[PDB]
A = this chain, B = another copy of it.
Amino acid sequence: MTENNRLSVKLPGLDLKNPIIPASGCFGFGEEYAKYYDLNKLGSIMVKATTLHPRFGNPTPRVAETASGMLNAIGLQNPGLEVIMTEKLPWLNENFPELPIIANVAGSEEADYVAVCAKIGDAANVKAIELNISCPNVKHGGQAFGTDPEVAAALVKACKAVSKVPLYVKLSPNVTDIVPIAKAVEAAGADGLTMINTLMGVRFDLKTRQPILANITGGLSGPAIKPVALKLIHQVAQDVDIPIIGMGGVANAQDVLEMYMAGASAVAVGTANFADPFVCPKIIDKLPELMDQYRIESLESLIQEVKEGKK
């Protein structure tokens, strides 16, 4: 259990021993991957989305492969706030008391998000909230909260007022211009940003001529989308004064450093966990030597250098 100061980064509510964080929905609540390695090795964990009431999710097939990526239409399946508050989070607190947890929150309307945000912070191990705003807003014809600056802002304001831990907002890449949404979310009180959530994709079965996913459409993730994430992160980095946790196709230590060059302060790893269960600890192990090669004394230093040498 040897730590490394060169890797530690301090973000609102998050004192990370290293920047690697499994992405929401790709690590469950840590109970399965904990069998492969010691979770304390991680900087933090973005557990799957929690919703007020239990959610079974969408019908199957729920996933499909793509070139260097995958599609998923899981549907945010989870046991609900109660079970997560009484069973899932406590398990993590009991087995990994020192591991900070980032609680992903979802919902169909503002009322749902508010309910989860106000409560989830009660968990001793939950140190920050990540708002999944790619959800359809039933109060807006089904439009995703993340595709309207003003709608997203109001959601963030309400949530900020009831949250007991720093509030992070996961931005959607499915928009014409990301700057307005990011500016508005920051103006509304967000303590930080995470990006990006998935792109939208579809695969067709040639034999049935039907979509592979029952939901027809699915979220696209994996290395395929990394260029889009880097583009958006870099774009948002030029106009906000709050930290960004970057994600989207990160599969190795080189990608993590690339995320930093774009303006990220920490890096989440999702889809890659499915291909290699040990990807996160491998990345953590590899970072120091890669940093040596690229003349990086520490990640904290890098974040500052990138912030001042905007180019």
Knowing A66-B226, A217-B231 are in contact, say whether A204-B71 is a contact too (CB < 8 A).
no
Knowing A209-B309, A231-B202 are in contact, say whether A224-B69 is a contact too (CB < 8 A).
yes
Select one of B67, B147, B234 contacting A223, CB under 8 A. B67
A306–B209 touching, CB < 8 Å: yes
Instruction: Point out the residues of chain B lying under 8 angstroms from A217, CB to CB.
Output: 231
B227–A203 touching, CB < 8 Å: yes
- In angstroms, Cα B309 to Cα A209, docked, is 10
Decide if A188 is an interface residue (CB 8 Å cutoff): no
A202–B234 touching, CB < 8 Å: yes
Decide if A206 is an interface residue (CB 8 Å cutoff): yes
Instruction: Point out the residues of chain B lying under 8 angstroms from A230, CB to CB.
Output: 201-204
A59-74 contact mask (Cβ, 8 Å, vs B): 1 or 0:
0000000111101000
A207–B294 touching, CB < 8 Å: yes
Decide if A174 is an interface residue (CB 8 Å cutoff): yes
Shortest distance from the beta carbon of A52 to any chain B beta carbon, whole Å: 27
Decide if A262 is an interface residue (CB 8 Å cutoff): yes
- In angstroms, Cα B305 to Cα A84, docked, is 47
A68–B224 touching, CB < 8 Å: yes
| Interface-side segment among A38-46, A88-96, A163-171, A253-261 | A253-261
A200–B176 touching, CB < 8 Å: no
Instruction: Point out the residues of chain B lying under 8 angstroms from A203, CB to CB.
Output: 227, 230, 258
Decide if A210 is an interface residue (CB 8 Å cutoff): yes
A220–B228 touching, CB < 8 Å: yes
B231–A67 touching, CB < 8 Å: no
Shortest distance from the beta carbon of A68 to any chain B beta carbon, whole Å: 4
Which of A68, A225, A227, A305 has the most chain B CB atoms closer than 10 A to its own CB? A227
- In angstroms, Cα B209 to Cα A230, docked, is 13
Decide if A311 is an interface residue (CB 8 Å cutoff): yes
B227–A261 touching, CB < 8 Å: no
Instruction: Point out the residues of chain B lying under 8 angstroms from A234, CB to CB.
Output: 202, 211, 216
A206–B294 touching, CB < 8 Å: yes
| Interchain residue pairs with CB less than 8 A apart (19) | A66-B223, A67-B68, A67-B222, A68-B69, A69-B227, A199-B199, A201-B231, A202-B227, A202-B231, A202-B234, A203-B227, A204-B230, A204-B258, A204-B262, A205-B261, A206-B258, A206-B261, A217-B231, A224-B225
Residues of A within 8 A of B (CB): 66-69, 71, 147, 174-176, 199-207, 209-211, 216-218, 220, 222-228, 230-231, 234, 249, 254, 257-258, 261-262, 294, 305-306, 309, 311
